[PDB]
Amino acid sequence: LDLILVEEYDSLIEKMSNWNFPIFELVEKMGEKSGRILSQVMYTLFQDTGLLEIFKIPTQQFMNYFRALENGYRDIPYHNRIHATDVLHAVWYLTTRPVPGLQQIHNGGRIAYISSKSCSNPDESYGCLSSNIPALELMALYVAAAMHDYDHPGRTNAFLVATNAPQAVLYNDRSVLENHHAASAWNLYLSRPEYNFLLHLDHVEFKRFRFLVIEAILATDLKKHFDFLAEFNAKANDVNSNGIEWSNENDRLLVCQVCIKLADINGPAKVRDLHLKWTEGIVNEFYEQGDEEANLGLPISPFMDRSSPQLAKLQESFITHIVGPLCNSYDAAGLLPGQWLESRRRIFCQLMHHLTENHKIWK
Amino acid sequence: LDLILVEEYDSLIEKMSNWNFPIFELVEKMGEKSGRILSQVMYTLFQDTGLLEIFKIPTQQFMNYFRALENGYRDIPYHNRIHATDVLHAVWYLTTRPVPGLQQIHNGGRIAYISSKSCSNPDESYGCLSSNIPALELMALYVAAAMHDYDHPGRTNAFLVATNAPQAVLYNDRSVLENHHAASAWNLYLSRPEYNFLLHLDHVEFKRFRFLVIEAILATDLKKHFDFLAEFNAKANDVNSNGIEWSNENDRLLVCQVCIKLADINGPAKVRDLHLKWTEGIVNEFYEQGDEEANLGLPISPFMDRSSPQLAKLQESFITHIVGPLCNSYDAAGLLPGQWLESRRRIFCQLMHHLTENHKIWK
Ligand SMILES: C[C@@H]1CC(=O)NN=C1c1ccc(NC2=C(Cc3cccc(I)c3)C(=O)CCC2)cc1
Ligand SMILES: C[C@@H]1CC(=O)NN=C1c1ccc(NC2=C(Cc3cccc(I)c3)C(=O)CCC2)cc1
Ligand SMILES: [Mg+2]
Ligand SMILES: [Mg+2]
Ligand SMILES: [Mg+2]
Ligand SMILES: [Mg+2]
Ligand SMILES: [Mg+2]
Numbered sequence: 001l002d003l004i005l006v007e008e009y010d011s012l013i014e015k016m017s018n019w020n021f022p023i024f025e026l027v028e029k030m031g032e033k034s035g036r037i038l039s040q041v042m043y044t045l046f047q048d049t050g051l052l053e054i055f056k057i058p059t060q061q062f063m064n065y066f067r068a069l070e071n072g073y074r075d076i077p078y079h080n081r082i083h084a085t086d087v088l089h090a091v092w093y094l095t096t097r098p099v100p101g102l103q104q105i106h107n108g109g110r111i112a113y114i115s116s117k118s119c120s121n122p123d124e125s126y127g128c129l130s131s132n133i134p135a136l137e138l139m140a141l142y143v144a145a146a147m148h149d150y151d152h153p154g155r156t157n158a159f160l161v162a163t164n165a166p167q168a169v170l171y172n173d174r175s176v177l178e179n180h181h182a183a184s185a186w187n188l189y190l191s192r193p194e195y196n197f198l199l200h201l202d203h204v205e206f207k208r209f210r211f212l213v214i215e216a217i218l219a220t221d222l223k224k225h226f227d228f229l230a231e232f233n234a235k236a237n238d239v240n241s242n243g244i245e246w247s248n249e250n251d252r253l254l255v256c257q258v259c260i261k262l263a264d265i266n267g268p269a270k271v272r273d274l275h276l277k278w279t280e281g282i283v284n285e286f287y288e289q290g291d292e293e294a295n296l297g298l299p300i301s302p303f304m305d306r307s308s309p310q311l312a313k314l315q316e317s318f319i320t321h322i323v324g325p326l327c328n329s330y331d332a333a334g335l336l337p338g339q340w341l342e343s344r345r346r347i348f349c350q351l352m353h354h355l356t357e358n359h360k361i362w363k
Numbered sequence: 364l365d366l367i368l369v370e371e372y373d374s375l376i377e378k379m380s381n382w383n384f385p386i387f388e389l390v391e392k393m394g395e396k397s398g399r400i401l402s403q404v405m406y407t408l409f410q411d412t413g414l415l416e417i418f419k420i421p422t423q424q425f426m427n428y429f430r431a432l433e434n435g436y437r438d439i440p441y442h443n444r445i446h447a448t449d450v451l452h453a454v455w456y457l458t459t460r461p462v463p464g465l466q467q468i469h470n471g472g473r474i475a476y477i478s479s480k481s482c483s484n485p486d487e488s489y490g491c492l493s494s495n496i497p498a499l500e501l502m503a504l505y506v507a508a509a510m511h512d513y514d515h516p517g518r519t520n521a522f523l524v525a526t527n528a529p530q531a532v533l534y535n536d537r538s539v540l541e542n543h544h545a546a547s548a549w550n551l552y553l554s555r556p557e558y559n560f561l562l563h564l565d566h567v568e569f570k571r572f573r574f575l576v577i578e579a580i581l582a583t584d585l586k587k588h589f590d591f592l593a594e595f596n597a598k599a600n601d602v603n604s605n606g607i608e609w610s611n612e613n614d615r616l617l618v619c620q621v622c623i624k625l626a627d628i629n630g631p632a633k634v635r636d637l638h639l640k641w642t643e644g645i646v647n648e649f650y651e652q653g654d655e656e657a658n659l660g661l662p663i664s665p666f667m668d669r670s671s672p673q674l675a676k677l678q679e680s681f682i683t684h685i686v687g688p689l690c691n692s693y694d695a696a697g698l699l700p701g702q703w704l705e706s707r708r709r710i711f712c713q714l715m716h717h718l719t720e721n722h723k724i725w726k
Contacts, residue, residue, distance in 0.1 A: 164553065170533075170546050172577045182535050190532065214535045 465490025
């Protein structure tokens, strides 16, 4: 409302500048307009990174699409607009904040690079992925986060598969959910001219962007979790490996894929209060799949029977086997944003500590 | 009351026992009932192998389903019912006839194996894949040959992706056609109970069968050709390896996938008369696609311009870069059914001869 448009932006930016962004408060603060949280956060971020400028993105069609995408998220405990916004905030944060030791290459026809206005590298001893990953590719990453769980039913792929859901048959049982999120969101994008916010990309650019978004969204199928980790590890952490070549297209993508994977399951690397909040969501969603499995005569899957819960086993397990090694690898590659110390170690990494702390709760 | 049945059977079997099975003569002989050529061939091969007996397959539902499958193939010049019958004939043949040097591991438990009634290994110096690959797996391979190009539109994946066809968007530009052939054919199968010829397989066997059929059909996407060839040459044709491990599920599957890939593009490895009949079909199909491309103001694809043909370059290239290396690769593995001349020392393989000869036509 004139001068309130700026106060709203500057404040949100202020709150999001935190890894432990108090996202639920924002939800509470939006009140009856909390259903527009994903589109609102998108606008703010594409503006923080200068993406609207770089690709001459028209505001109207940009908001039309993301407003329509939002309403595509179901009202379920975990895989909703809020989780999508959460994942978006994570990748935006992980690709723009200072990282100790990271080597730079190029900041700002030619290949454009973004740069967050809400943060900067303290000195030449830091670096950010945004100086090594072109704008288009990071834009693809942000967009993929927004669409990555679009129209999620609150059920797993094995559930869909085991019950011969039409969606599973349609996708031959492969990454059923992930294929549907990507196909539906792109279907949505191409269904109306008023959504065409990428109209200024040339045909080659648009085609590559579509490919990237799809590649990030499919990377979120946990079934391929171990193949992805192996690859990434082989590229930067394993001995012999030359490391990540930032000038190599496939290396960038892989990094980005790993980045959205970490963001997608970020809960345990957040402050306890946030962690316990996302924990409650996934278990409530599981119980719902369990009630349906039982009603269908099927055996209740492990961790989904409310009358026989194993909440600590779930978090202990899932952290030890999936989240942990993943953050471990990303961190061992020197990509986690953090700060120099000069405790006993020279670098303090906030998520690494949250992860450890939250792990004691359940171990 | 039913004598004119066995005459047919013994006839067709006699004719199919030949690599250069005169499939076009059979289309003629069937006259008006030729539209049911695939279902009829399926039944004949399932008797020949004993799959009907092994899996207690009820004739009624079996014929119902494969008659429905057949009518799903469009009336186009190459990717039709006949082509599917051709591929079907080729996987059965590659899998049942004598292979020089192939150890007769399963020379006769709980796991069933099929045996073609129309042939046998003259002796110990011969073998056959039907003895190293379980009945359930070969059955999946045959059923996939049956369904592999179901509801093919006579257009390429590239064309689909470019015109942004709904199916292209629905599958995220990944093996569009192949995913659709498999998804449509399983949807059909499940749409009605009178199609359930597999009702005597347990949910475990059926689930695995489904997986194998999908794996085989998706393996026919030429986009993944060099990957399969490479992944194959590793496990079967290179360094410090004694080759395949018939005991290994994955190795078995890779063998099956290369077998259906060969059968899928078998034309140039058949006798000159068969080779040219298939060549004619593929060129007319490319021309129909090229007309639509021009009509849409799109650039006409290579080899698809009927006003500026390159028929010889097409065949010479495709044999040199695709068919050829796939066979040489399959041969070095030693899986080709052939014959020693004069046994041991050397082996005469009919398909390699045809291939070399047909190449001379265009080079
Ligand atoms: C990251 C979130 C939030 C949090 O703080 N804690 N826990 C979380 C969380 C916990 C479990 C899962 N698991 C998911 C599973 C895999 C899985 C299911 C049960 C046990 C384990 I072992 C792994 C699937 O295949 C489909 C939906 C995602 C996903 C997220
Ligand atoms: C095996 C058949 C029958 C025969 O006897 N000769 N030729 C055959 C034949 C020739 C070419 C193709 N090509 C197909 C192409 C790839 C391709 C297209 C143009 C040049 C080359 I280089 C390769 C696609 O991506 C989609 C449909 C299948 C398919 C079959
Ligand atoms: Mg998901
Ligand atoms: Mg998610
Ligand atoms: Mg109930
Ligand atoms: Mg095909
Ligand atoms: Mg085919």
